[PDB]
Each structure stands twice: as C-alpha cells, then as structure tokens.
Symmetry: D2
Subunit: 296 residues, 4 copies
C-alpha cells in the first residue's frame, strides 16, 4: 500500500479582505516545509473548508502542490464531503492536480449508516489511484466510522490505507491496530499525539504544528524512531498550548495564535467563525509565551 | 440602527402542523412529479406548512439547483391553498445561508428554516452573527433549527432569546434535542417565541408546554394524524392530542431505527407512496431487519393514499 | 394498586453539632404538611441517605411517620441500596414501622444488568406488602432501569406501582405512559414538573418543595385537575429557583436555601458534601429573593 | 513518597453457599503471587465490595494480608465509600490489620463537589500513615476527580501518591503526568493498559489479571522496563478478552470466566449482580479459548 505518514500540518487558510491570501498561504507552507514537516493538508477542518468556495478549495490545493515541488513533502488534500458525489469529484480533482493523497472526513450532519459509510468511501477510493486516509471526528460529524467498517475499507479497497482519528478514544486506537496492524493510524488530536504514536500510530495531522512545526515534527520523528522518551518529553511540554488551541472551536484559537505571532497579517475568519472572546484571546497570548515560535 | 426590543413588535410567523418533506428520487434524479404529488397529499390532509429540502429531504446530497427546484415546486404546489412553505435554507457557511435565504424570499417562500451550522462548530457569538446576517438579508420569517446530535453545536437558550429580541424576522426555534428542560427554559424566559417540535415522539409534551407547532417526519406517512394531534393541542384539547401522540409512539420511534430519512423513505415505499426506495450516498437502504421492523409497525396505522 | 401520588417532598435532613436535628426534622415536616404537601420522602438523596447511619436512617423514618399521623399526608420512606439484601432489610423496616410506601433507588455504582435490576426489585417488592416506587436517576447511579424493565416490574409485582424519573428524558416518559398507562409516573426533576404531569404523570418528588411547598403543591394539584394553564404558569415562574437549586449537587443548594431562609439553624452537611462556593451561596440568595417563602 | 505500583489484581470474591469461600480466596491470591503479580486489591469493585458486609470486607483484607505475608506482594486494600466517616473507618481498619496501602474510590451517587472530594480525601489521608491511591471511575460514581484536585491532593497530603484511572481519557492521563510527573498513574481499564504505561503510568489494577495474571504481569513489567514493543504485543493480544470481560458489567464476566476456567467452584453473585445472558456466557467462553490460562 502506498501511504502518506509522518508529521503533517492541517493548514490554516489566511484571509485578506474576505479573500484567500494566496501569497501568505504559500509562505506558511514553506515555513512548514523548512521546519521538518512531512506532509501538508490543505483545506481541511483547520483550513475552514466549509466556508471556502469550490474554486478557492481547488486553488489552495494547487498552491500546496506547487509549493512542495522539489521537496519530499507530500500534499494530503482535504477532499471530504457529506455528499458522496461531491467527495468523489473532490478526490478526482486532487488526483488530477498533483496531490499525493486525499484526506476524506466522515460525512457530517446527515448521519450515514455503517453500510452507507462503506459505500461512500468505496466510491471515493475507486475514483482515484492515490492513497486515501479516512478521517473520523464524531464530535463534529455526528457519526462514527466503526473499527469494523474502517478495517473492511482498508482490506477491501486498495487505496484506503488508514484513518485520522480525532475521537479521544485510545481504546479504539488499540482496537484498530490490534486487529489490523497494517493500517496507518494518524493522530488528529494534538494533546494525545504521543500516546497514539507510542501504540503504533505512524503520524499526526496537527493543528499545533501550524504554530510550532519544528516541535510537532520533532515529536513525531522521535516516536517513529522509537525514541519514546524524547517524543513524550515534547508531548508533555506542548500540552498547555495543545489544550489552549481548543479553548474555542478550532481553528479560532490557532488563527488567533498565528496572528499574535505575526505569521498572518489579520485575524480574519469567515462566518459563522469569528474572533474568540477577549478573555480567550488573552489566555492564548499568555500560553504562547512559554514556547519558542519559529518565524519565516 | 439596531435595537434589543423586537420581542413584542409584530412578527410574521409560520406555525401549526408542518411536514419535513422527503425528496423522492427516480433514476438518480429528483422525481419532480412525485414531489408535487406528495405535497398535494399533505395539503389535502390538514397540514399547515411544508418544509422542502430539509434534513428529511436529503438537502446535503441535492445540488444547489435541485435544492432550488424543490423549493419552487413547493411554492407552486401550495399556491391557492392555506398551506405555507417554510423553505430549508440553512448552511454551515454564512455566505451560503444568506444566498439560500435570498432565493427562498425571491421565489415565493413564506419563510425559511435555517439549521445551526454543522461540522465547523461556531461559537455562541458566531451563531449570533450567523443568524443576524441571515435575518438582515431577507424580510420573511426565520425559524432557527437546533439539532445538536447532527450539527455538533447547540444554540443556547440565551442565544436564541437574544436573536428573537435583536432581529425582526427571527420568531422561534425548531428544537430536536431531547431536552424538555430547555423547552421550559425557552418559553419561561421568552414566552413570545414560537417553539416548534422537531422530534415526533415528543410532539405533545412540547405542544402542551406552549409550543405552537411541529416540523414532523411522521407526517410524511400519516399527515392526518399529525395534523389532528397539533390542532387538538393548539385548541387546548390536550386529551385528544395526547391520545394521538401515545398511539403514534411506535411509528415515531421506528422512523429513527436508522438515521432519518432512511426509515421514513422506506415506510413511504412500503405504503406505495413513492415508486422506488432510492437514496443518494452516503444514505442507503436500511438493513433487512429494520426494513421488516418498519413494515411491521406500519400495520398498526391507517395510511392515507393519494 | 395501592399508590402514593400527588405533591411530594424529598426532605432535607438538618444536622446540629454533627447529629440529626430531630426537632428541626419534625418541624420541617409539619411545615410541609401545613402547605398542601401530599407525602414526604424521608432519607432520600436530598436527605443525605449516603452519610446517615442505619440508626439515623431508621430514626428519621420514625419521625416522619409520627409527624404525619392523623393527617392525610403519607410517608414514602427512602429504602433503596445497591445491595439487594440491604434494600430488602430497609423495605422491611419501613413497612414494620408505619411507612405508607417506599422509594427504592436503582443500585448505584455496581451497575447491575436489566436482569439484575429485575431480580433486585422483585426481591424488594415480595419482601413487603406496601407500595414500592422505583427511582431512576442514571446521572447518579451509573445505571438505568429501561422502560421494558420498569413495565415488566410494574406488571409482574403487585406492589410496584410506578417510577420516579430523574433522567431528563421526556421521550422515555411518553414511552412509559403510552405502553403502560396504568403506572404512576413521578417527576424527580423539578424544572420539568409540569411537562411530566401534563403527559399523565401523577405526582412529583420535589427538591424545591422543601423551600416552596405551597407552590409545588399548587402546581401539582392544578395539573392533576388538567388546569394546565395555571400549572404551567407556576412551573414557568419556578424555573429560576428550580435551576439554581442544582448549581451545585443537590442537596447542597437546597440546604443552603433553607439556611438562608432561616428554616434550619445550621448550614451543616456530612462529608463528602460541603458548603457551596461563596459565589453560589450569593447566587442562591439572589434567586430566592424573587420568591414568596413561607415560614413555620 | 511511599508507593505501591506495578502489576496489581482487583481480586474477585468467590462465594460458596451464600458465604465468602475463604479457602478459594486464599488459593486465588496464591495463584496471583506465583505469576509475577506485584500486589493484590481485596474487596474492590471487582470483589463485589458493595454487597459484602463490613465483617466480610474486613475478613478478606485479613486473608489477603496473611496470604501475601513472607512474599514481596503487597496488599492495596479497597477502602472507599461515599460517606467520609465510612471511608476513614475503612482506611483505619486496613492500616490496623496489615494492609500496605488503600485504594479509595471517589464517592459514588452523592456527587460531591471538587471541594468536597478534596476534604473527603484529605480526611482519609490524615487518618492513616500508609499510601493512599485515589480511584477515578466516573462511569460508576457519577462524579469526576478533576486533574487539579488529584494534583492538589497529591501535593498537599503525604499519603496520596497517585490515582487509578478508569475514565477512557488518555488526554487526562497526559494532563496528569505532564503537570505532576511525580505521581503514580495506575491503569484501571485493562484494554488501554499499555497506552497508559507507555506515557509514564507505573502500574495497573487489573480485572483481566484475575484470569491471566502472567500476561498482565508481563505487560506491566515489559513497559516499566521500557520494552514498549513487547508490552504492546501482549496488550494487542489481550484486547479481545479485555473487551469481552466488560460485555456485561464487571465483575459479571470475569467471575463467569473464572468459573469457566475451573478456577472457582461456583458462578455465584450477590444481588443485584447476576449471571450473564446465555449469549454473553457463550461469548466469554469463546473468547477465552484463544488464551493460555494458568492453573493452580
Ligand atoms: N468545502 C467546500 C464546499 C463547502 C460545502 C459545505 N459547506 C456544505 C456541503 C453541502 N453538501 C452543500 C449542499 C447545498 C444545499 N444545501 C451541505 O450543505 O451539506 C461543506 O462541505 O461543509
Ligand atoms: N442508606 C443508609 C446507610 C448508608 C450506607 C451507604 N453509605 C453505603 C452502602 C454500601 N452498600 C455499604 C458497603 C460497605 C462496604 N464498603 C456501599 O458503600 O456500597 C450507602 O448506601 O450510601
């Protein structure tokens, strides 16, 4: 199985007067590349996929692809949808425009069954010839892709090689790798990056890496090298920032942090997302002071 | 300028018995003739409003144009009747929700249902700005829709009440949260709003506490019974409304043995009201067992034809 | 079926120098009797059953029975336990010492199965010849008596006549009365007293009635006569106090309120229960100022 | 800080004609000692603490202490209660009768506040001079000991040296050891034994070790010696039995499994606990066949 593993960053999408700041986007990706990241995930949840247009979604995948040219860094394009026909079209674009693989979030809102989830992902996997990573985040979607369903998709579909789990369920992470140790389990929750990696997980899709790419990449590579003592040391140091980056719904805190660090020019979201409370803004600023934030 | 005293300034409302319309498919396309036929069946069985392209209508898997087409069919079919059209117009992107509201307004809908943004989990402040933008975009009634099990977020009582008091067009909320405490909270602190049952099994408890209508899944199959229940309750004939609610519990529950609208479309097919049991992925046919369970609960109810 | 229904009070247990204030106990009960209450529940959750000795538990039931003699007010003695042998002994005491019935909470902590709950409650019901009201409160016990189990127990055991629900699950309350309308559904959550009664519930077991017995009494009796407009008005008026009385775990707020009203002489709990926060202490007092509190 | 760590067993309590089978109790403990176990926990949740009398509770601690005398295996006696006066009395007994330390579950059912939990545990720790391990299991108690409270108790009370966590919250376990790395985090959920140990947890209080003490022992010692690959190997191998041992509420499956393995004479519980369903009985049997069960 072709895989995409290692330290990965769920890229924020910087806005400038209600438009994608395409130049800042490429600059932010180069900063990720130059700080040891193994792959970038354009237009995921952290990238405000929901409020980007179809064309903007496609533009950011192209910017990510162009910027990682000449490096080893892969582009795991965000291509999920709660409509299978739409998710299939997004997978096909990502394949045809140079993405190395796709991240495909479990359908949100319409609550498909396990059978429907199976057919949803089978259709996506059959549409392309590049790796496909499932993404389970029941707190956001309202559904869950069961261990059995994930394992069936991994065994039945060539392209499906693992899952990004954001479910606060280390039991499930044992369950998955105990019954299908060949799959690539990817942490989708920064605070528990090390426990997932120490159980045989092979990478992270990180929010924190947007702000501290060197530390997340170092954490991941230590674990992948079975230096669990050094990996845990960074996970412990990062807990305070890992937690505060979710004091409000992601990506509200991480964008606040990127703005406070001078890495984006404006603290701009698209509704229904918004600036955090003044109190949480202040709390984010204070936590940041304990970490060394790389510039450009 | 903006002000905080809209609670008692005349609000156009859409209340009573309402149906979350299923969207029939035929060879992967919207069966538009069946759609209108189903709406006429609702009109002829005492329903007060229809909700095109909501959750039960598989809004998520319809194209933007199909979404718009079904609103137009709903509007056209309800012309000349007493039945209003509460068009599904929500989105988790505010830009998109605003455009959907504007379409519904410009194409004859009487109001819009606007579900809380799903998946991206806005804050209470974000939800406030989201609905303020929508309400300021059109001049037709806006019913908020809270269903946290599907969206991942909840519109708090405080936020709902703030929206009712701050925005002229926001007149109430459709609650699907299994939270009768919240329904007390809402109407005890802002009794002027229209609380709408979004959970068929608890239609009567919500109505008996001052709720003013239902947006029903069961009404797809049994429109006469849901409309009778609602009108009894609105007339304070709580004995007769509760009697129907209790009788409807078995079908009300089985219609969610799998994720709505999978069972209701199954039931509509078994009753001969739609010609094919067709969904759009990721939605699909139910299991055998649940198919049999739905068929078997249906045997207890008298299903009106066309 | 012999039943105990109507407006009922989960009595607080006042302490005085670490011992049960037996005179204040009787005085509080008389206050309930004189303000329209139909039954009292001695030594339930609100009475801090967990920290009373067997002798204090038994002493408090005797005080309730003695105080309601010659009145229309019944004693629904708290007699549950997570050990069936203990619950049987507790039921037998209440019967042999004049209680009109028993409330028996579902076993807490040890999480019996539905079969276990059935055998647990059958043993209790067969041990006595007085009514047995089940008590479902999953947030506290960690278990739930399913609708099927409650209905089976109601149909299989003569003396089991209903259930006190504290589960915030109005769907379940429809479920219960739609499929077994003969049972007595009792509200165990003050804020939703009216919704449960308006659906055919026949009483409440109230925390708020400790402080405002006349108001919970009028609410219940209005509703039982299908004067739903008057009952809903009191339920709506009571929401603020009904909610603040759970700003910390009951009975911490209600005992605080009883102390603030001068109805008990000490704000004394037994550990692990404790005084509320000073902030919540002030919040309870402010909510109370909006309500008409009867004296002795 | 005096500590009790390593591989520990929450001992089942076998019954014989409605009484504690005291001879089987000692033999089962002797089996644990002979398979590398570091300590035994008499009369915990798995030992049906809720339905034993005070004298049976006291008898089993004495049997545990006597049987581990002359060996290096310690006795961490179950001594919790939801009444602080009771929890102090049980702690005092355990010290006074030779236990090496006490496990004290968070008060169940009465839902103390964090302030109440602090005062509850402070009272327990001050009553004895032996180590005190907190036990957090919110699914059973209805309350949670917050990370702040655990750390505060650890820092303020000499005897409180850690916590046994049964909360399916690996985030909280990172939180605990990142902010207070000196405490002893003990796994209370067998399926996630390895992830908790690999993050710096120092032991387990196991249900599975009742049946497979050699495997749970090896798992813990592999991890404590930083052979994470071998510890993960047994954890993955043990998942099926770890999961099936909770298909019904613990200790219903483990006692069933011990009976099916011929390690106890009867499949006897105390109500409200009961035999499993025939289906789950069959499921436990089936899963067991894949594992090598040590005899006597
Ligand atoms: N990420 C780029 C496109 C965003 C589209 C959408 N906001 C909603 C997707 C949709 N299926 C659109 C249906 C249009 C009719 N309401 C949905 O709203 O569920 C999403 O995928 O979250
Ligand atoms: N209700 C009046 C007496 C209170 C008894 C007890 N505190 C403890 C009940 C008990 N079964 C006692 C077991 C003794 C061994 N720990 C329990 O704690 O589970 C409770 O039921 O909450």
């Amino acid at each position: 199985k072709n895989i995409i593993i290692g330290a990965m960053t769920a890229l924020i999408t910087p806005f400038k007067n209600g438009k994608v700041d395409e130049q800042s986007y490429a600059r932010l990706i180069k900063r990720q590349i130059e700080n040891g990241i193994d792959a970038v995930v354009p237009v995921g949840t952290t990238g405000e996929s929901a409020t980007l247009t179809a064309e903007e979604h496609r533009t950011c995948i192209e910017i990510a692809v162009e910027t990682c040219k000449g490096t080893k860094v892969k582009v795991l394009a965000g291509a999920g949808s709660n409509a299978t026909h739409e998710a299939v079209g997004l997978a096909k674009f990502a394949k045809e425009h140079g993405a190395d693989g796709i991240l495909s979030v479990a359908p949100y809102y319409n609550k498909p069954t396990q059978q429907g989830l199976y057919e949803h992902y089978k259709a996506i996997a059959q549409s392309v010839d590049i790796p496909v990573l499932l993404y389970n985040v029941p707190g956001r979607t309202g559904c869950e892709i069961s261990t059995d369903t994930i394992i069936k998709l991994f065994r039945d579909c060539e392209n499906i090689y693992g899952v990004k789990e954001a479910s606060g369920n280390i039991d499930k992470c044992v369950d998955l790798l105990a019954h299908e140790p060949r799959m690539m389990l990817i942490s989708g929750e920064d605070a528990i990056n090390y426990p997932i990696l120490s159980n045989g997980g092979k990478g992270v899709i990180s929010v924190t890496s947007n702000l501290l790419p060197d530390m997340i990449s170092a954490l991941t590579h230590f674990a992948l090298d079975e230096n669990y003592k050094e990996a845990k040391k960074i996970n412990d140091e990062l807990y305070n920032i890992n937690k505060i980056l979710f004091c409000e719904s992601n990506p509200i805190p991480i964008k606040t942090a990127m703005y406070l660090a001078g890495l984006i020019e404006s603290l701009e979201f698209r509704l229904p997302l918004c600036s955090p409370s003044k109190e949480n803004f202040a709390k984010i600023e204070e936590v940041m002071k304990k970490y060394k934030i790389k510039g450009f």
